[PDB]
Amino acid sequence: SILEERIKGVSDEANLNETGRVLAVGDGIARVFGLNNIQAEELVEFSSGVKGMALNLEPGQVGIVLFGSDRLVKEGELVKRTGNIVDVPVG
């Protein structure tokens, strides 16, 4: 319809499922918006060169913990699900 079409033209599009986008960062913890498929204690990999572990999944938001570095992460970059729990090699 025309109503949907005027929204579609002025929108960059989003939805935010299986990726999320950061809202604010600092204290060596970050706040990402979305990520409603994540597992509890999963590892996420950021598109900035850093990995973090989700600790608090709150409705409609997630609080990742950044394993070093506060520089790489900035508000508006995309956080992606690795899809596996945090593990370490054993053997």
Partner: protein, 187 residues
């Protein structure tokens, strides 16, 4: 001026909206139009359920606002500016909220006293007319205020019914009486 203060947060907006629209005597117009422009956001199933909660900047949302008023030109000048205010503070999830409150404020002006007459099961239509008659007769609605009866089915009301409107209620249920009884059993 506002007539009475109702609602907590996101009612500061609704309050403010009625008192601005009060000076012209066109709140009824403003509110109707708001229902029709809100519904056309909903019948935008993507980006009108997927952009109520913050997800994009203030500015993109503002431009989503500009696009909503260019496609619907009847919205009244108070509600075309209220949207601007909401977009700049960067909120749209409590958009239905100001709308709902603004309806209550408006219908206090119309002089409608909205009411739910929950029952266990849907009652007959005759039972309805008679409740509307009676409730008018009873001093809970002094007259001057036009009651509406809205039927609801709640099988969680286990037997009986509850008549609710304003701050005045008559609870003539079976369900409560059972709960009270069950506790009371000692012998």
């Amino acid at each position: 001026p506002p007539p009475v203060r109702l609602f907590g947060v996101e009612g500061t907006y609704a309050t403010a909206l009625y008192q601005a629209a009060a000076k012209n005597s066109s709140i009824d117009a403003a509110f109707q139009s708001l229902q029709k422009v809100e519904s056309t956001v909903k019948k935008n199933p993507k980006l009108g359920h997927l952009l109520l909660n913050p997800a994009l900047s203030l500015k993109d949302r503002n431009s989503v606002i500009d696009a909503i008023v260019e496609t619907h030109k009847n919205l009244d000048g108070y509600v075309v500016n209220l949207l601007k205010v909401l977009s700049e503070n960067n909120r749209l999830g409590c958009f239905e909220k100001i709308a709902s409150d603004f309806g209550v404020l408006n219908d206090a002006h119309n002089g409608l006293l909205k009411g739910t007459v929950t029952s266990a099961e849907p009652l007959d239509p005759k039972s309805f007319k008679r409740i509307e008659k009676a409730l008018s007769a009873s001093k809970l609605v002094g007259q001057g205020k036009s009651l509406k009866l809205e039927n609801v089915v709640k099988p969680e009301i286990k037997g009986g019914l509850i008549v609710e409107l304003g701050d005045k209620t008559v609870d003539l249920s079976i369900s409560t009486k059972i709960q009270k009884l069950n506790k009371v059993l000692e012998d």
